[PDB]
């Protein structure tokens, strides 16, 4: 169907036991080192967020995606079209919050959410550390629109972490620059200025909160904030890894942690 085509949906396997959503600047390929260990036990569903470089820019409705809710509607639509009545949802970065929002509307569709590199709020205030002051964000946005290619080349090593010459850095630079520059600026603004803190107490689906100990966009205190304020049962595990896309750049240390949280309930 057109929704599935538009999001490059892939379904690997069959059966009841069953979804992985990616973060800004990448696409479903971010899961390449995780998927091989899932396909024997689960029906695996991959999809791309609207606005990813692998998607048609004509379908990027700026009003629809001006709030994270637009993306959660897309997720629910995919689940409905595939006739999935229950899934484990694994969300990277913004997709963790997209999954959370989707679970507020349709908690019946999710048995568990596993979050990788998640944050409900990036901007600091006097009683909250998200990692960024508004002035930092303003300069980032300014850099994006002034020269997108240059911004991508400087940002990718920082976001990915590790060696600046790595395959993961090269690959993230590529998917980042694959986004149309106006869409990249708009999505960046929407995400980096989001605030999901206030809805956390309303979450009912259990959540596993995982992140790298060194993450450019997610201070460790954010994981504890999520744990303290989510209304569901939750658990946190901070991984001895570097990077915002650790499942791609450091799979040997990260994949075993993600698998434990997928396979084991709280």
- Active-site hit among 244, 249, 250, 261: 244
A 10 A CB-CB count for 125 gives: 10
**Is 61 one of the annotated active-site residues of the chain?**
no
Cα-to-chain-centroid distance, residue 205: 17
| Backbone torsions φ then ψ of 191, nearest 5 degrees | -70, -50
Strands (E), 35-127: 44-46, 87-92, 110-116
Measured from the CB of residue 160, what is the shortest distance to ligand KKN in angstroms? 10
Residue nearest to ligand KKN as judged by C-beta position? 217
Annotated active-site residue in 27, 48, 74, 215: 215
Looking at 72, 74, 93, 223, which residue is catalytic?
A: 93
Q: Would you say 79 or 160 has its CB closer to ligand KKN?
A: 160
Look at residues 53, 54, 52, 47 and name the one whose alpha carbon lies nearest to residue 10: 47
Least separation in angstroms between CB 118 and ligand KKN: 9
244 assigned to active site: yes
CB 14 within 8 A of CB 41: no
Q: Kindly list the residues in this chain that would bind ligand KKN in the complex (CB under 6 A).
A: 24, 93, 122, 132, 140, 159, 191-192, 217, 244
Angle between helices 167-177 and 148-160 (to 10 degrees): 140
27 is catalytic: no
Q: Which is nearer to ligand KKN, 50 or 82 (CB)?
A: 50
Q: How far is the CB of 95 from ligand KKN (least distance, A)?
A: 11
Catalytic residues: 93, 215, 244
């Amino acid at each position: 169907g057109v929704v599935e085509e538009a999001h490059n949906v892939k379904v690997i396997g069959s059966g009841e036991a069953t979804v992985l959503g990616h973060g800004f600047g990448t696409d479903q390929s971010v899961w390449k080192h995780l998927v091989p260990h899932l396909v024997d036990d689960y029906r695996v569903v991959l999809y791309d967020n609207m606005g990813a470089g692998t998607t048609n820019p004509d379908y990027f409705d700026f009003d629809r995606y001006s709030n994270l809710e637009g993306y959660s509607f897309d997720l629910i639509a995919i689940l409905e079209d595939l006739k999935i009545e229950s899934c484990i949802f694994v969300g990277h970065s913004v997709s963790a919050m997209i999954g959370v929002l989707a679970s507020l509307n349709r908690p019946d569709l999710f048995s568990k959410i596993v979050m990788i590199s998640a944050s409900p709020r990036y901007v600091n205030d006097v009683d909250y550390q998200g990692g960024f002051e508004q002035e930092d964000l303003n300069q980032l946005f300014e850099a994006i629109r002034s020269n997108y290619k240059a911004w991508c080349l400087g940002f990718a090593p920082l976001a990915v972490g590790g060696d600046m010459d790595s395959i993961a850095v090269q690959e993230f630079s590529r998917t980042l620059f694959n986004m149309r520059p106006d869409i990249a600026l708009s999505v960046g603004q929407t995400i980096f200025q989001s605030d999901m803190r206030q809805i956390l107490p309303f979450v009912t689906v259990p959540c596993h909160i995982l992140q790298s100990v060194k993450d450019l966009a997610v201070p460790v205190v954010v994981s504890e904030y999520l744990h303290a304020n989510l209304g569901c049962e939750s658990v946190v595990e901070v991984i001895p890894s570097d990077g915002h896309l650790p499942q791609l750049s450091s799979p040997d240390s990260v994949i075993p942690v993600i698998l434990r949280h997928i396979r084991n309930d709280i």
